[PDB]
Amino acid sequence: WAARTIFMKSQIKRQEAVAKAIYDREVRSVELALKIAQQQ
Amino acid sequence: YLVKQEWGATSITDKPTVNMLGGYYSQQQFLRNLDARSFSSPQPEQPSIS
């Protein structure tokens, strides 16, 4: 049980890291597209 | 009277418990239970960690 809960904690941390990376990339692209669209 | 006396002690052992293996159990499951099978598909036959 202890090994299992450690494993799920690691998996959850990994999923949060992946989601944070995707969100950061998307938000950066969105802001930069905002600046570009404002230019035109 | 001249030969050195030899006393013998006998022990017999078996496979360890999951609890007493410690964090090694988790550190081997991270390496086999998810990494190898999912990201390589080697389809091997391997014994238990214990």
Side-chain angles (χ1 to χ4, degrees), chain B residues 14-50:
Chain B
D14 211 287
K15 74 172 42 53
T17 323
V18 176
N19 210 331
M20 55 189 32
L21 276 186
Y24 173 84
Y25 194 50
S26 63
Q27 283 299 19
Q28 189 96 40
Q29 257 182 352
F30 178 51
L31 225 62
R32 304 201 291 111
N33 244 23
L34 256 199
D35 209 316
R37 289 141 203 182
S38 83
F39 276 117
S40 325
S41 179
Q43 312 154 359
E45 192 198 12
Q46 291 186 5
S48 322
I49 295 172
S50 302

Side-chain angles (χ1 to χ4, degrees), chain A residues 4-20, chain B residues 30 34:
Chain A
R4 204 41 51 181
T5 183
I6 275 287
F7 197 53
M8 242 70 47
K9 266 156 137 145
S10 195
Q11 226 159 20
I12 286 171
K13 284 272 292 303
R14 274 210 271 301
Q15 270 154 359
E16 321 195 90
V18 155
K20 149 146 166 300
Chain B
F30 178 51
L34 256 199

Side-chain angles (χ1 to χ4, degrees), chain A residues 18-34:
Chain A
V18 155
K20 149 146 166 300
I22 299 168
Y23 164 84
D24 277 298
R25 174 181 330 300
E26 284 292 329
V27 86
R28 164 151 61 269
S29 182
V30 153
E31 307 195 337
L32 199 54
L34 257 182

